[PDB]
Amino acid sequence: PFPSAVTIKSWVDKMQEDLVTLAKTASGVNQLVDIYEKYQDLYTVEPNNARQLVEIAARDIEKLLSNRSKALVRLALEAEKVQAAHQWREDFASNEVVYYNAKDDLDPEKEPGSQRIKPVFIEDANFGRQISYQHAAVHIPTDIYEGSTIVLNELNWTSALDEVFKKNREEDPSLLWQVFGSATGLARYYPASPWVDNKIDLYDVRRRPWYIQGAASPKDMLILVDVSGSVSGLTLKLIRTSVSEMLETLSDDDFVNVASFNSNAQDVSCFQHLVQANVRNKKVLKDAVNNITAKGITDYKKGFSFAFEQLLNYNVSRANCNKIIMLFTDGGEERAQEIFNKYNKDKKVRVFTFSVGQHNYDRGPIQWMACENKGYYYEIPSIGAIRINTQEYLDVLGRPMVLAGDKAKQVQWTNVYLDALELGLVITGTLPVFNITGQFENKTNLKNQLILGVMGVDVSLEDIKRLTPRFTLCPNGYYFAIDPNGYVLLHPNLQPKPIGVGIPTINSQEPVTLDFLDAELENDIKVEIRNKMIDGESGEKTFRTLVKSQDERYIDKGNRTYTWTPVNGTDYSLALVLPTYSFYYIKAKLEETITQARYSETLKPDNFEESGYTFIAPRDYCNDLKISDNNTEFLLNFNEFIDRKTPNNPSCNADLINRVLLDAGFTNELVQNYWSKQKNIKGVKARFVVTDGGITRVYPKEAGENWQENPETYEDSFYKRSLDNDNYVFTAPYFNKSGPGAYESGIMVSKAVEIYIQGKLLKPAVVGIKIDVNSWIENFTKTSIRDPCAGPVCDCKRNSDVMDCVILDDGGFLLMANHDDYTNQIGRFFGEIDPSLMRHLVNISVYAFNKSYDYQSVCEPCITEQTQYFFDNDSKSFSGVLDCGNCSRIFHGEKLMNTNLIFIMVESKGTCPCDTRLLIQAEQTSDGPNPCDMVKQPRYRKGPDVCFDNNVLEDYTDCGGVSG
Ligand SMILES: *[C@@H]1O[C@H](CO)[C@@H](O[C@@H]2O[C@H](CO)[C@@H](O[C@@H]3O[C@H](CO)[C@@H](O)[C@H](O)[C@H]3NC(C)=O)[C@H](O)[C@H]2NC(C)=O)[C@H](O)[C@H]1NC(C)=O
Ligand SMILES: *[C@@H]1O[C@H](CO)[C@@H](O[C@@H]2O[C@H](CO)[C@@H](O)[C@H](O)[C@H]2NC(C)=O)[C@H](O)[C@H]1NC(C)=O
Ligand SMILES: *[C@@H]1O[C@H](CO)[C@@H](O[C@@H]2O[C@H](CO)[C@@H](O)[C@H](O)[C@H]2NC(C)=O)[C@H](O)[C@H]1NC(C)=O
Ligand SMILES: *[C@@H]1O[C@H](CO)[C@@H](O[C@@H]2O[C@H](CO)[C@@H](O)[C@H](O)[C@H]2NC(C)=O)[C@H](O)[C@H]1NC(C)=O
Ligand SMILES: *[C@@H]1O[C@H](CO)[C@@H](O)[C@H](O)[C@H]1NC(C)=O
Ligand SMILES: [Ca+2]
Numbered sequence: 001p002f003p004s005a006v007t008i009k010s011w012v013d014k015m016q017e018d019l020v021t022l023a024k025t026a027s028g029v030n031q032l033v034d035i036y037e038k039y040q041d042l043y044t045v046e047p048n049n050a051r052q053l054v055e056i057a058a059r060d061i062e063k064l065l066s067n068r069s070k071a072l073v074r075l076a077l078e079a080e081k082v083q084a085a086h087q088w089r090e091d092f093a094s095n096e097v098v099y100y101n102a103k104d105d106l107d108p109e110k111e112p113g114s115q116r117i118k119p120v121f122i123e124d125a126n127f128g129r130q131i132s133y134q135h136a137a138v139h140i141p142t143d144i145y146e147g148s149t150i151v152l153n154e155l156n157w158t159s160a161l162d163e164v165f166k167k168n169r170e171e172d173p174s175l176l177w178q179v180f181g182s183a184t185g186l187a188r189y190y191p192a193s194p195w196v197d198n199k200i201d202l203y204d205v206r207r208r209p210w211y212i213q214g215a216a217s218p219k220d221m222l223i224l225v226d227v228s229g230s231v232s233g234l235t236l237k238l239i240r241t242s243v244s245e246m247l248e249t250l251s252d253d254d255f256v257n258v259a260s261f262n263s264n265a266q267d268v269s270c271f272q273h274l275v276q277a278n279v280r281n282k283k284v285l286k287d288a289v290n291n292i293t294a295k296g297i298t299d300y301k302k303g304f305s306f307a308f309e310q311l312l313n314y315n316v317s318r319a320n321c322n323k324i325i326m327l328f329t330d331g332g333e334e335r336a337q338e339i340f341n342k343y344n345k346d347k348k349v350r351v352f353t354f355s356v357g358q359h360n361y362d363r364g365p366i367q368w369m370a371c372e373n374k375g376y377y378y379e380i381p382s383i384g385a386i387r388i389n390t391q392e393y394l395d396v397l398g399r400p401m402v403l404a405g406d407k408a409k410q411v412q413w414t415n416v417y418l419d420a421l422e423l424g425l426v427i428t429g430t431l432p433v434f435n436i437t438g439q440f441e442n443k444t445n446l447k448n449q450l451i452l453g454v455m456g457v458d459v460s461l462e463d464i465k466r467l468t469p470r471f472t473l474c475p476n477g478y479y480f481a482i483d484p485n486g487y488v489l490l491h492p493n494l495q496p497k498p499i500g501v502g503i504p505t506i507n508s509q510e511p512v513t514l515d516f517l518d519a520e521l522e523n524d525i526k527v528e529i530r531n532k533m534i535d536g537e538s539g540e541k542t543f544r545t546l547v548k549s550q551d552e553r554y555i556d557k558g559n560r561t562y563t564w565t566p567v568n569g570t571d572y573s574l575a576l577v578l579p580t581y582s583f584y585y586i587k588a589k590l591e592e593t594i595t596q597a598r599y600s601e602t603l604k605p606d607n608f609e610e611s612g613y614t615f616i617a618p619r620d621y622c623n624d625l626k627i628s629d630n631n632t633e634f635l636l637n638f639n640e641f642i643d644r645k646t647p648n649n650p651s652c653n654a655d656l657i658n659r660v661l662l663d664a665g666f667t668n669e670l671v672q673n674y675w676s677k678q679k680n681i682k683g684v685k686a687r688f689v690v691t692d693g694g695i696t697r698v699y700p701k702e703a704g705e706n707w708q709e710n711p712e713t714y715e716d717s718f719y720k721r722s723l724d725n726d727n728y729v730f731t732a733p734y735f736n737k738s739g740p741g742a743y744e745s746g747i748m749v750s751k752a753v754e755i756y757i758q759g760k761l762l763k764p765a766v767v768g769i770k771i772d773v774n775s776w777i778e779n780f781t782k783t784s785i786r787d788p789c790a791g792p793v794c795d796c797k798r799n800s801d802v803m804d805c806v807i808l809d810d811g812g813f814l815l816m817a818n819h820d821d822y823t824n825q826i827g828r829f830f831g832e833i834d835p836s837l838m839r840h841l842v843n844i845s846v847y848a849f850n851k852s853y854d855y856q857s858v859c860e861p862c863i864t865e866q867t868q869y870f871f872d873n874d875s876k877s878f879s880g881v882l883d884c885g886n887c888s889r890i891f892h893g894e895k896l897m898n899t900n901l902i903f904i905m906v907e908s909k910g911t912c913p914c915d916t917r918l919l920i921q922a923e924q925t926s927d928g929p930n931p932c933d934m935v936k937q938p939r940y941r942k943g944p945d946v947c948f949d950n951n952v953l954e955d956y957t958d959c960g961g962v963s964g
Contacts, residue, residue, distance in 0.1 A: 001790070001792075001794060002890050002892075003794055003795060003892075003905070005877075005879075005892065007786075008892050008894055008903075008905065009894060011783060011784060011795075012894040012895075012896055012903050013897075014783050015779075015780065015783060015807075015896060015903070016896040016897040016898075016899060018779060018783075019728075019749075019771075019896070019899055019901075020728060020897065020898060020899055022681075022683045022684070022769070022771075023728055023749055023751060023769050023899075024751075026678075026681055026683070026684045026687060026769050027687060027689070027751060027767035027768060027769050028670060028674045028675075028767065029751055029753055029767060031670060031673070031674050032666075032670055032689070032753045032765055032767065033753060033754070033755060035666060035669060035670055035673075036666070036753075036755045036762075036764065037755070037756075037757070039666065039669075040757070041589070042588070042589050042591060042595075042662060043586045043587060043588050043589055043662060044586075044587050044589065045584050045585070045586060045587075045757050045758070045760055045762070046584070046585060046587050047583065047584060048472065048473065048578065048582060048583050048584065048585055050540070050561065050563035050576050050578055051540075051563060051565075053576060054563050054564065054565050054574055054575065054576045055565055057467060057468045057479065057574055057576075058565055058566070058567040058568070058574045060467040060468075061464060061467055061468075061481075061567050061570070061572070061574065062567055062568060062569055062570060064459065064463060064464070064467060065413070065429070065459075065569075065570055066569070067172055068175075068429050068457050068459050069411045069429060069431075071168040071171075071172065071175065071178065071457055072411055072429055072430075072431040072455050072456075072457055073409075073411075073431065074164060074167075074168070075161065075164050075165075075168070075178065075180070075431075075455050076409065076431045076432075076433050076455050078160065078161065078164045079158075079161060079180065079433050079452065079453075079455070080433060080434060080436050080452075081436075082157050082158075082160040082161070083157060083433075083435065083436065083437060083452055084436050084437055084438075084439065086153070086156075086157040086437075088153060089152075089153065089156070090149055092112070092113030092149075092152050093113065094111070094112065094113060094115075095113075095114075095115040096113050096114075096152075096156070097113055097114050097115070097152055097155045097156045097159070098114070098115045098116075098117060098159075099114065099116075099117060099135075099137075099138045099155055099159070100116070100117045100119060100135065100136075100137045100138060100192055101114075101116060101137075101138055101140065101146065102137035102138055102139045102192070102193070102194060102195050103139065103140070103194070103195045103201070104116055106118070106194070111147065112147040113147060113152050114146065114147070114152070114155070117135065119132045119134060119135065119192050120132060120134075121192070121193070121194075124191075126176070127176065127191065127193070127421075127423065128422070128423070129193045129194075129421065129422070130193065130194075131191040131192060131193045132191065132192035132193075133166070133169065133190075133191065133192075134192065135162055135192055136161065136162045136165055136188050136189060136190045136191075136192060137188070137189055137191075137192040137193060137194075138155065138158075138186055138187070138188050139186065139187045139188075139189075139195055139203065139205070140185065140186045141185050141201060141202075141203060141204050141205075142200065142201055142202075143185075143384070143387075143388075144184065144185045144186075150184055151184055151185075151186060154182055154184060154186060155186070158180065158182070158186075158188050161180060161188060162190070165178050165190035166190070168190075169190060169191075174463065175190075175457060176191075176423060176426070176457075176458045176459065176460060177189050177190070177191065177419075177421070177423075177456070177457065177458040178190040178455075178456075178457055179205075179428075179455075179456045179457075179458075180433075180453055180454075180455055180456070181205040181206065181208070181210075181211045181453045181454045181455075181456065182205065182452070182453040183206070183395070183450065183451060183452060183453055185204060185205060185206060186205070187205040189421075193421065196420065196421065196422065203420065204387065204391070206391050206394075207248075207249060207387070207391050208420070209251060209414050209415070209417060209511055210414045210428040210430045210454065210456050211430070211453075211454045211456075212249055212251060212394060213251060213412055213414055213430050214412060214430030214431065214432050214454035214455075214456070215394045215395075215397075215398055215432065215451055215454055216322070216394045216397040216398050216401070217321060217322050217397070217400075217401065217944075217946070217947045217948055217949060218251075218253040218254055218255075218319035218321060218322060218943070218944055218947065219250075219254045219255070219256075219319060219321075219322040219323075219324055219397070220254075220255050220274070220311065220318055220319050220320070220321070220322060220323040220324065221250070221254065221255070221256045221257075221324050221325075221326060222256070222257055222258075222259065222274075222307050222310055222311055222324075222325050222326070223243055223246065223247075223256070223257075223258045223259065223326040223328065224259055224260075224261065224303055224304070224307050224325055224326060224327045224328065225239060225243060225258065225259065225260045225261075225268065225289070225292065225328045226239070226260075226261065226262075226298060226303075226327070226328060226329035226330065227260045227261065227262045227292055227293070227294050227295070227296065228262045228263075228294065228295075228296050228297060228298040229262075229294060229295055229296060229297065230294075230298070230330060230359075230361070231294050231329070231330055231356075231357070232294040232295075234357060234358065235330050235356055235357030235359070236292070236293075236294050238356045238357050238380060238382075238383065238386070239328050239356050239357075240289055240290055240292065241383065241386055242328060242354065242356060242380055242386045242389070242390060243258065243286075243289050243328060244286050244289065244290075245386050245387060245390045246326065246390040247277070247282050247285055247286060247289075248282075249390060249391060249394075250277035250282065251277060251415075252276060252277060252278060252415065252485050252487075252511075252513060253276075253319060253485070253943060253944055254276070254277045254319060255274045255275065255276050255277065255317075255318045255319050256274070256275065256276075256277050256281075256282075256285070257271055257273065257274045257275060257285075257310060258285045258288065258289055259303070259306060259307060259310070260292060261298075261299065261302060261303030261306065262294075262295060262296025262297065262298065262299070263296045263297055263298075263299045263302070264299070264302055265302055265303045265305075265306035265307075268285065268288040268289055268292065269284050269285055269287075269288035270284070270288075270931075270932035271284070271285075271932070271935060273310060273313045273315070273316045274310065274313065274316055274318055275931075275935050276317070276938075276941075278513070279499055279501050279510055279511075279513060280501055280502075280928075280931050281931055281935065283501050283502060284931050284932070298329075298332055298334075300332065300334045300335075300336045300339070301334070301336045301338070301339050304325075304336060304339045304340070304343070305339055305343070307325050308325075308339070308343035308344065308349065311323050311325070311349060316938075317938055317941070317943075319943060319944075319947075320943075320947075321947035321949045322350075322397060322947065322949045323348065323349045323350070323949075324349070324350040324351075324352065324375075324393075324397070325349060325350070325351050325352065326352050326354065327351065327352065327353045327354060327366065327369070328354045328356055329353070329354070329355065329356070329366065330355060330356060330357050330359050330361055331355055331359065331361030331362050331363045331364075331366065332361065332362065332365055332366065333362055333365060334365060335365035335368050335369060336365075336369075340369075340372065340373060344373060347373060347374060348950070349373065350373060350374040350375045350396075350397075351369055351370055351373035351374070351375040352370060352375045352376060352377075352378070352393055352396070353366035353367070353369050353370040353375065353377055353378070354378045354379075354380060354389065355377075355378070355379045355380070356379075356380045357380070357381065358381050358382070363379075363961075367959065367960070367961030368961075370959050370960065370961070371956075371959035371961060374396075374954075374956050375396065375959065376392070376393065376396045376958065376959060376960045377959055377960035377961045377964075378392065378393075378960070379964075395450055395451070398432075398449075398450065398451050399449045399450070399951070399954045399955075400948040400949055400950055400951045400954060401432070401948040402432075402434050402435065402448070402449055402450070402451060403449060403948075403951040403953050403954060404948050404951065408432065408946075408948055409431060409432065409434075410431075410946065411429045411430065411431055412429065412430050413427050413428070413429050413430075413570075413571070413572075414427055414428045414430065414511070415427070415483070415485075415487060415511040415512070415513050416461065416487070416488075416489060416494070416511065416512045416513070417510075417511040417512055418496065418498070418508045418512060419458065423458070423460055424460065424461070424462075424496050425460070425461045425494075425496050425512060426458045426459065426460050426461065427458070427459060427461075427489070428456045428457065428458050428459075429456065429457050429459070430454050430455065430456050431454070431455045431456075432451050432453075432454055432455075433451060433452040433453050433454065433455060434448075434451060434452065435447065435448040435449070435450060435451065435452055436448065446955065449954065449955065461489075461490065464481075464489065464490055465490065468490070470714075471619065471656065471714075472585050473578065473582055473585070474578070474579055474581065474582035474585075474692075474723065474763070475692070475713065475714040475716075475719060475720050475723065476547070476558070476560075476577075476579045476582065476720055476723055476724065477576070477577055477578045477579060477582045478491075478492050478576075478577050479574065479575070479576055479577075480492075480516070480519075480574075480575055480577070481567070481572050481573065481574050481575070482516055482530065482533045482534065482572065482573050482575065483571055483572050483573075484534055484571050484941060484942035484943065484944075485513070485941045485942075486515050486516055486517070486530060486534060486939060486940070486941055487513045487514060487515055487516070488514050488515070488516055488519055489572055491514070491516075491519050493514070493519040493520065494512070494514055494519060494856075495856050496512070497512070497856040497858070498510055498512060498856070499512055499513060499514060499855050499856060500854075500855045500856060500857055500862040500863040500864075500928075501863075502862070502863065502927050502928075503862055503863070503925055503926070503927045504859055504861040504862050504925070505861070506861055507861075512856075514855060514856070515939070516530050517530065517939070518853065518855060520547075520548070521545075521546050521547070521548055521555075521850065521852060522852075523545055523546070525541060525543045525545070526545075528541075529541055529562055529564065529575075530940070531940050532564070533564050533566075533573040533575060534573070534940060534941065534942045535942065536566040536573060536942075537564075537566070538564065538565040538566065539563075539564065540561065540562070540563050541561070541562045541563075542559070542560075542561045542562075543559075543560070543562075544557065544558075544559060545557075545558065545559075545560050546850065546870075547560070547724065548852075548868060549717050549720065549721055549868075550715065550716070550717035550720060551717040552866055552868065553732070553811050553813070553868065553921070554717075554721065554810065554811045554868060554870070555850060555868040555869070555870040556721055556724045556725060556810075556870070557724070557870075558579060558724040559579060559580045560577055560578070560579055561577070561578045561579070561580070562575060562576075562577055563575065563576045563578070564576070571942075579723070579724075580761075581723070581761050581762065581763045584760045584761070584762055585762075586659075586692075586762060586764055587655060587659075588655065588658035588659045588661075588662040589658070589662075590654075590658065591658070591662075593647060595661075595665070596642075596647035596648070596661055597647065598665065599661035599662065599664050599665040599668075600639070600642045600643060600647065600661065600664075602614075602664045602665060602667070602668035603616065603635070603638075603639065603664050603668075603695070604639055605635070605636065605639070608701070608704075609701070610671075610672065610676070611667070611668050611671055611672075611697055612671055612675075612688075612697040612698050612699040612700070612701075612704070613697065613698055613701060613703070613704025613705075613707070614635065614664075614695065614696070614697050615631055615635075615695065615696035615697070615707070615711045616631065616634060616635050616638060616660070616694060616695055616696075616711065617693075617694025617695070617696075617711050617712040617713055617714070618631070618634050618711060618712060619656060619694050619712070620653075621638070621652055621653050621656050621657050621660070622641065622649065622651060622652040622653070623651045623652075624641075624651070625637060625638070625641060625652075631711045634711075642657075642661075647661070659693040660693050660694060660695060662693070663691045663692070663693035663694075663695045663765075664695050666691070666765075667689055667691060667695055667697050668697075670689065671689075671697060671699060675687050675699050682772070682775055683771065683772060683775050683776075683779075684769055684770065684771070684772070685700070685703065685745070685746035685770035685771065685772050686698055686699065686700045686703035686706070686746065686769075686770040687699045687700075687767075687768075687769060687770075688703070688707070688767070688768050688769075688770070689765060689766070689767045689768075690709075690713050690716060690718075690719050690750075690765065690766045690767075690768070691713065691764060691765040691766075692713060692764045692765065693713070693764075694711075694712065694713050694714075695713075696709070696711070696713060703745075703770065706740060706744065706745045708739055708745075717731075718731045718748060718750045718766070718768065719750070719766050721750070722750040722751060722752040722766040722768075723752055723763055723766070725752070725900070726752075726754075727751075727897075727898035727899065727900055728749055728750070728751045728898050728899045728900065729749065729750050729751070729900065730747065730748070730749045730809050730815060730899060730900060730901060731747075731748040731749070731750065732809055732811060732813035732814075732815060732827050733745065733747065733748070733826065733827035734827055735813075735825065735826070735827035735828040736828075741826070741827065742773055742826045742827055743773055745770065746770030746771050746772055746773065747770065747771040747773065747776065747815060747816075747826075748768055748769075748770055748771075749768060749769050749771060749899070750766050750767065750768035750769075751766070751767055751768070752765075752766045753765040753766065753767060773816075773823070773826065776816055777816060777823060780805075780807070780816055780818070781796070781797070781798060781818065784796055784805060784818070785797060795905070796818035796905070797818070798818070798820070799818075799819060799820055800818055800819070800908075801908070801910075802907060802908050802910070802911065803818075803905065803907065803908070804817075804818065804819070804834075804905065804906050804907060804908050805817065805818040805903075805905050806818070806822060806830065806833075806834075806903075806904060807896070807901050807902065807903040807904070808830050808901070808902050808903075808904065809900065809901060809902070810869075810870055810871045810900055810902075811829075811868070811869055811870070811921075812829055812830045812831070812838065812847060812869045812921070813827060813828060813829050813830065814826055814827065814828055814829075814830050814833065815827075815901065829919075829920070829921040831918050831919035831920060831921060832918045832919075832920065834906075834909065835916050835917060835918045835919045836882065836884065836909075836914035836915060836916065837882065837891075837904075837906060838919045839919060840880075840882055841878075841893075841904075842869075842919075844878065844880070845872060845873050846871070846872075846873065846878060846893065846902075847869045847870065847871065847872065848869065848870055848871075848872035849867055849868075849869055850867070850868055850869075850870070851865055851866065851867045851868075852865070852866055852868075853865050853866070853926075853928045853929070854866055854923065855928065857923065859925045862925050863925075863926065863927060863928040864923035864924065864925055864926060865923060865924060865926040865928075866922075866923045867921055868921075869921065871895075871900075871902070876894065876895045877892075877893070877894060877895075878892070878893045879891065879892040879893070882906070882907075882912065882914070884912035884913070884914040885912070885913065885914050885915065886912070887911065887912025887913070887914075888912060889906050889907035889909075889911060889912050890906070890907060891904055891905060891906035891907075892904070892905055893905075
């Protein structure tokens with residue numbers, strides 16, 4: 001029969017007592033506590049003033065960005081002057097311009113006016129590529145010829161930029177790239193490196209996001225696509241491709257909507273008013289455009305009366321400047337003067353008309369439409385012209401800002417994106433270069449209304465991470481930065497991968513934009529904090545929050561303090577996250593050389609046998625010291641650097657080395673004093689200790705090989721979980737993996753060491769014990785059953801036909817069970833085993849499911865969706881019958897004290913046959929939030945407030961029709 005409540009309570013208490021006493025008397029929690037207090041005077045406890053740390057880091061970031069901006073300013077000034085001094089030569093001798101071309105074979109062994117350079121590249125670990133500091137490299141795309149009179153002249157006058165490149169690199173030796181995009185297509189970057197290796201190069205500097213950002217202002221684009229009968233065939237395909245390519249030239253500050261009209265206008269997609277050009281809204285628009293079919297009779301007066309009306313909707317968020325209309329058609333007869341005179345008579349909306357396809361229609365009304373209203377006229381007769389014709393409109397948009405003068409020259413930083421030359425995540429500062437030919441004397445201003453190009457300097461996210469040190473903080477603490485759009489400049493979750501836009505269809509260029517709410521669990525307080533950081537305010541917030549574990553299988557509850565201050569002079573805002581225990585940290589004392597030598601003796605490779613297999617985190621301690629992926633090489637390197645020259649050396653971080661050696665001494669003292677006394681423990685497979693300061697030691701040698709955790713202590717998930725929890729934490733092993741299962745490695749349970757210096761609280765180290773599966777299962781079996789209770793089993797035997805005994809963790813994964821096949825399935829989620837039982841537990845509020853979306857994830861032909869189950873009711877007791885289909889199974893669940901395990905004893909599914917749709921806990925490729933519903937309630941984003949959208953001097957006489 002079903003055991004009584006007092007009997008099962010006693011049974012759970014016995015199992016608890018056994019496990020907790022084994023863990024406490026095997027891993028020396030009190031032992032390390034006593035060691036830490038009684039080895040005082042070798043360290044001091046220093047405060048962590050968040051208001052000071054975040055301000056210092058913000059000031060450092062501001063200084064770095066000002067350094068990066070001064071180079072742009074001086075480069076732009078020099079380029080403007082050199083263009084002002086240039087003479088337009090036409091007769092170029094075969095050797096008059098000298099450059100590298102950055103795309104020629106280095107060994108040709110062999111032009112109209114150019115002489116190539118054979119440069120020398122040695123190496124540079126700062127870039128990873130092979131670079132030359134002697135001269136700059138020029139990239140000319142495949143389409144544009146390098147012998148044209150328009151390209152040779154720039155190849156000549158831009159040659160003066162190399163001196164300023166060298167001057168900037170010698171003033172600030174940390175400059176990565178210094179690129180000068182040109183209006184003709186060529187790009188000049190200072191460190192001479194070969195271009196990226198069918199290998200055809202489609203790169204065009206005039207389409208990169210930084211160039212587009214620096215060449216114009218945020219736009220309000222409304223593409224108007226003609227879908228009448230006449231555009232059927234090749235014209236429709238060209239229109240679709242051209243619209244997609246035009247959508248590709250849009251940033252997050254830009255708002256766009258695509259409409260269509262044969263005889264009555266309609267929105268092409270679910271959007272109705274306007275959407276910002278994210279990576280997802282753009283995909284929605286592209287798919288809706290690719291679904292377009294052509295049928296009907298053209299009606300311009302009903303399409304423009306629709307475009308102008310959606311350009312007047314102010315209930316929604318928009319860039320509120322540069323209201324432009326794109327007309328994609330073939331040709332017609334109606335110019336529709338009445339519509340323009342009615343809607344746009346003061347001429348505040350630009351109109352760009354495109355004549356797509358190969359035909360013989362009247363290209364007359366559309367040229368007049370692009371002429372009367374501000375705009376330019378384009379013709380796309382083939383796929384080749386699509387790129388240039390779609391990218392050219394920025395030249396037209398750039399006139400107001402150049403006419404503004406030396407007021408639009410403001411440095412703007414792009415979103416995080418993967419570098420073209422493979423440096424990883426970078427951000428580029430952009431400064432436009434104006435045309436000042438004949439500036440001193442008021443003679444020429446007709447062609448001075450077009451930009452020469454955009455200057456750009458790249459700063460890597462590694463620099464910004466280096467400006468924010470994290471090793472004085474607890475692993476749970478971290479830094480993050482937010483831009484006005486809400487995306488993260490810095491975040492631990494952010495990874496160098498393109499953002500998943502949707503489910504991968506069967507059979508790097510895009511910016512990496514990850515929102516703050518999409519990098520952590522969304523919470524009500526975290527939205528207010530995000531809004532405050534966007535507004536640019538400084539404040540403190542302490543609140544209870546749910547934090548996802550690093551392994552992403554668990555959710556644990558902790559106290560966190562958010563401190564944020566704006567990076568003044570820059571749109572970005574910086575914030576610091578600190579748990580309560582992280583407010584105080586241990587700083588190692590200088591001590592003496594004898595102590596350093598004694599501590600260095602501990603972790604030598606020959607000393608593994610006594611100390612245990614030692615892991616050292618790959619943290620850079622010296623500039624010459626090189627971190628390695630394999631921990632053995634790094635440990636050998638650290639040993640030889642410490643022993644060979646000095647424990648403390650110039651150009652090395654004294655604090656980090658002192659902390660590491662102090663931790664090594666503490667760990668060796670622990671092991672030799674306590675662990676060595678008990679050579680073998682029946683319940684314990686292995687004893688390991690993980691300590692802040694990047695050292696990990698496990699006593700058994702076989703366990704060291706079995707140990708699969710990250711060498712870095714901060715990256716360990718179990719370490720962070722033990723920090724968050726004040727009780728013993730059990731970590732479920734991985735199931736059906738290449739790594740050894742929980743039969744040779746055991747079950748990992750970890751308890752955090754708590755230190756009380758003065759009244760302060762410190763949690764420097766975490767200890768763990770690996771539990772033998774065999775000892776655990778036999779102990780679980782013997783205590784559960786009562787020998788004289790009854791003939792039929794009152795509790796589970798080794799293989800109970802009826803009664804089922806399984807103990808679960810907070811995540812719900814199975815750690816121990818009576819059944820043999822269940823024990824073969826240790827480490828698996830308890831779903832796929834008794835899914836109806838899990839659904840009942842969730843329904844009665846035993847576990848709480850919280851789902852999220854990972855956007856930077858890779859699948860097999862993407863956004864995935866993850867689920868993470870946690871305990872949510874702190875009631876130690878739950879019972880009930882399952883009320884199964886036509887039946888009912890009785891269960892009782894008791895949680896095992898501190899250890900956090902939960903034992904549930906229920907009947908087998910033979911008794912009451914329920915349905916088994918599994919409750920899966922993995923990540924399943926799932927498309928993310930519907931964009932259509934998310935645009936109705938947008939998030940809060942601050943927007944640039946500097947727009948140059950009109951000047952009255954602007955000469956709109958270059959409309960294009962006349963010049964063709
Ligand atoms: C655009 O191309 C032109 C051709 O290379 C360059 O103009 C030439 O610059 C040369 C620099 O070596 C000048 O040579 C020197 O000029 C001085 C006058 O200061 C004279 O004594 C000599 O002609 C000569 N001597 C020296 C000191 O080497 C050429 O006079 C000059 N003229 C030509 C041939 O066009 C420009 O440099 C280039 N533009 C930019 C901005 O780089
Ligand atoms: C950035 O500079 C601003 C200047 O506006 C600083 O803000 C000032 O802070 C000082 C003392 O902290 C006060 O005397 C001023 O009244 C503040 N001005 C305000 C309210 O804007 C700010 O300290 C700097 N921020 C950083 C990151 O150091
Ligand atoms: C939203 O925009 C629409 C048009 O874009 C406008 O509709 C008005 O709605 C209010 C109340 O909802 C009513 O007075 C009328 O239906 C509309 N006003 C007019 C045309 O007189 C309005 O600008 C916005 N609606 C709201 C919610 O204010
Ligand atoms: C994720 O977990 C949190 C904490 O359990 C959820 O918040 C609770 O939701 C339940 C109902 O699901 C309410 O009864 C509680 O009052 C909520 N607590 C708080 C503090 O709001 C949260 O709703 C879960 N879901 C997601 C996906 O966010
Ligand atoms: C700014 O550059 C100066 C030299 O130009 C340098 O001393 C300083 O460290 C730089 N600031 C940074 C990189 O934060
Ligand atoms: Ca037609």
